Amino acid sequence: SGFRKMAFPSGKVEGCMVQVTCGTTTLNGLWLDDVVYCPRHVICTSEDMLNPNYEDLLIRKSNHNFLVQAGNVQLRVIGHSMQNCVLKLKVDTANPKTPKYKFVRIQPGQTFSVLACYNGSPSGVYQCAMRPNFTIKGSFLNGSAGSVGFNIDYDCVSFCYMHHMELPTGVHAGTDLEGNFYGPFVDRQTAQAAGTDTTITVNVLAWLYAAVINGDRWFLNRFTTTLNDFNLVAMKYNYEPLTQDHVDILGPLSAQTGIAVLDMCASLKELLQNGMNGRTILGSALLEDEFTPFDVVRQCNVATLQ
Amino acid sequence: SGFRKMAFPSGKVEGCMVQVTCGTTTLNGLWLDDVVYCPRHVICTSEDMLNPNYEDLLIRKSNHNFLVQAGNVQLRVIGHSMQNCVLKLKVDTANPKTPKYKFVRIQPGQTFSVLACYNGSPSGVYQCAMRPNFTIKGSFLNGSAGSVGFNIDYDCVSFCYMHHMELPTGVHAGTDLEGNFYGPFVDRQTAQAAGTDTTITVNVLAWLYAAVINGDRWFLNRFTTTLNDFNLVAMKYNYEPLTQDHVDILGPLSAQTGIAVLDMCASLKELLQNGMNGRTILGSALLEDEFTPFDVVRQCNVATLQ
Ligand code: NA
């Protein structure tokens, strides 16, 4: 029993973090095989960071300008490549702790674990949802760029996020491991705003299924809705529209509870319109939206064969 | 920026986690040097678990009865003994990944990270506080016993919790690494109840101070209270009574912010009675009590030298 936002175990990732210093700017890199991946603004001065021309800045850098440290071992940089907003530093040594891994680009409403690092050294780990406005509500201080987000499936680490920056509102923006930003953001110190965040509807529905399984079911009703009619109400209340892809991932919970997705949608719709009127769901007056259908099935209480 | 319930990186603990099987009963063990620590109820059949005489049940077990797997490597048990509620299985191979470590008994109110494991495979990591009633509100399913709780101090792992059971309320109970239960619980399937789960008042207050440093102080007011009249309200809401000693603990944060502890108490009193009115504090719509007075400032935003 018990619902907790858990991160995946971070060990396979810890053995890949290094420190990357380019002159008087430092951040973290990810060391896989003989390549170290890091945010390209490691080549900037603080002044450069206002309006960098990264191609012009990189021309002035040589392999010797990059100092890469794996604990107490210096790795010699033998080539470098800018790819979108990440730098790929080829080093003379393959990382012996390289896990089986892939790079994947995640979608809003999906979760991943963040390993926050400073100076190449892992600091803490926590679970994030990619918000519909393509920011994450992380915890990140100066020097944390190059920290990565990931999911783990058996032994295979799927890297999906590299941290780059913090917006004026205190939320966080980064790239996938190919170096393309999530969202409309750029790695310059300019006045950028993230769009209005919206509630991740599929995750609230998963939460509601979890509530039913644990016996909390006052909010169920006998009403019917089309998906388009439900989505019109969702958009009014700044909830994300439910897609067929969301309906697919709610399949197992629907099957195990016998509540069709569109019936649980009609139940949510009444919640949005009428509020919760002093009732609670799973012991809270607020609807959770960062437990995915996968999270819910993994942690939900289960039947007991007696 | 950002404020998150963060756990320590779990890599140093992942390398210690093994599966222990005795008959058809399996759970996790902690492999340090040539010893595996696990909950003693691995020797029970399910029917044994109701009212076990552990001494009698252990007498009928031999070394050969314990199967230990570290990944694909089988670890043969070459001695065994019981210590309170844990077993120490001596194995033929010292763990080459043993970190620097110690066993420590934490206090109610203190925090620790949990590496939840099943079949000796680490599954997830999250941060918990030892509740005033000596329970933990974690996410644990069948087969998670033997999962451990820990803090990391640079390179040294302080193991402080080993998981054993779930009470009828869904809350979790366990032991230190010498096998002594936190709280009055016993490792048998009986009708046990924990004491009242109170909110950790000193932790909420430290969090309010961290809020002020970050710039959330909409809850600050000009009112002040005495310790007694605060505790009147505290008991009404099942907050721990605030002692003068707790008041002393908050001295440093009080000096950091210029805010008298009893003035912060006045703000907390008003928040308890009137709620937050749709405002949040450090991104939370609830009063957070899982951050210790030392831990809270580490995530605060800092001054920027311009
Ligand atoms: Na600088």
Numbering used by the authors:
A (entry chain B), B (entry chain A): 1 to 306
Question: What does the original paper state about this entry?
Answer:
Finally, C7, C9, and C13 (all in the context of C145A) have crystallized as rings composed of seven dimers. These all belong to space group C2 with C7 and C13 having seven monomers (half a ring) in the ASU and C9 (C145A) having 14 (complete ring). Notably, the large 14-mer ring structure composed of seven dimers has been observed from three distinct C-terminal variants crystallizing in different conditions. Analysis of the crystal packing with PISA27 shows the main interface between dimers ranges in surface area from 800 to 1000 Å2 with the ring assembly as a whole predicted to be stable. However, we do not observe evidence of these in solution and oligomerization appears to occlude free access to the active sites for external substrates suggesting that barring some negative regulatory role or inactive storage form, the oligomers observed are likely crystallographic rather than physiological interactions.
The main protease of SARS-CoV-2 (Mpro, also referred to as 3-chymotrypsin-like protease or 3CLpro) is responsible for the majority of nsp processing, cleaving at 11 conserved sites along the polyprotein including self-excision of Mpro by autolytic cleavage of its own N-terminal and C-terminal autoprocessing sites. SARS-CoV-2 Mpro is a functional homodimer of two symmetrically disposed protomers that are each 306 residues in length (33.8 kDa). The active site of Mpro features a Cys145-His41 catalytic dyad, which orchestrates nucleophilic attack at the carbonyl carbon of the invariant P1 glutamine and the formation of an acyl enzyme intermediate central to efficient peptide cleavage. Using C-terminally substituted Mpro chimeras, we have determined X-ray crystallographic structures of Mpro in complex with 10 of its 11 viral cleavage sites, bound at full occupancy intermolecularly in trans, within the active site of either the native enzyme and/or a catalytic mutant (C145A).
